[PDB]
Amino acid sequence: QKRFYVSIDKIPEHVINAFVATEDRNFWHHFGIDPVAIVRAAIVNYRAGRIAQGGSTITQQLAKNLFLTRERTLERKIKEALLAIKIERTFDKKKIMELYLNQIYLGSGAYGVEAAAQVYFGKHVWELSLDEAALLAALPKAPAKYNPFYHPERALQRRNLVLKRMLEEGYITPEQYEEAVNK
Amino acid sequence: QKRFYVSIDKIPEHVINAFVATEDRNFWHHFGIDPVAIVRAAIVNYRAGRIAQGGSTITQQLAKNLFLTRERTLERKIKEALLAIKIERTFDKKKIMELYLNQIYLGSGAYGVEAAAQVYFGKHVWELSLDEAALLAALPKAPAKYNPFYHPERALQRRNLVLKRMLEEGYITPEQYEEAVNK
């Protein structure tokens, strides 16, 4: 799971933005933990079926994956929160983004955006289109549930959802959006 | 402490080698933990005053520095060992080396080789000489004890010690060694 690595400079901005708008819209501004995100995850909590948003920042996700074992207790989330905060104090956002983007499991035995660009589109991460970038960003939350190889229904759906988030965040134009959702 | 970052490709091989020969001679071959190193640290333990070598790999050092708090308990060393092993499974050696080399505290408020190349020699890490590289590698174990700014005695000494390790590891030639130790 250390096959393809790619520096952040060789990663399309559509890809980075796709992941940010989908998983941590604030990423560039917080310190490893996102307060508002936890509260916004809490207000869209009981107001959407006592559960919805994630609250977890990209950094917490990176941390989460730095543990050998895979417990999911409370203190675990905390050890990840502390780790994420130290990580934030040690490396800059572009570096954290880079690491996260290269370690993130994206299903079908693919780790990192490069590996995924290959397994899913036979291309290099830097050859990806907006709609291709959007598809990858839709995987992190659940690679097996949204795997385009056997749940293309849910996959395509969550992909167009990523695209809407990007549009709302201003990462893409209405023109580009209409274009992508139809691919 | 996130000021100057420098990709590993812009880092002199004398620098990398200086750190490897001094802190983790096996770095490129182990899996995050170095068994032999712990045993060799143990045999040169009672045979040198019941204590000497370090046993800690570069990866354990990186891990050690990824904790917000700075405890030094037993389980702490273990959490670092597990972390180091997962890190090893996630990123390749050149990447780990890169991260470690950019986070490592080298005294005088300098973090990373770039920051140090400036604070200590007014140069960029890539402009360093063998004897300059050697000096930095001599800092990690104790920046205040070996700080060239006020312990130039101990500093110069441990610097020539790094140079000997490099020579023994074959990273430099006898010619280069004699040259450097006299700078």
UniProtKB/Swiss-Prot annotation, chains A, B:
**What does the UniProt entry say about where the protein is found?**
Cell inner membrane
Positions of the region Transglycosylase? Answer: 1-153
Q: What is this protein called?
A: Penicillin-binding protein 1A
Output the lineage of the source organism: Bacteria, Pseudomonadati, Aquificota, Aquificia, Aquificales
Q: Active-site residues?
A: E23
**Gene, per the UniProt record:** mrcA
Q: Which family does it belong to?
A: In the N-terminal section; belongs to the glycosyltransferase 51 family. In the C-terminal section; belongs to the transpeptidase family.
**Could you say which residues of the full protein are shown?**
61 to 243 of 726
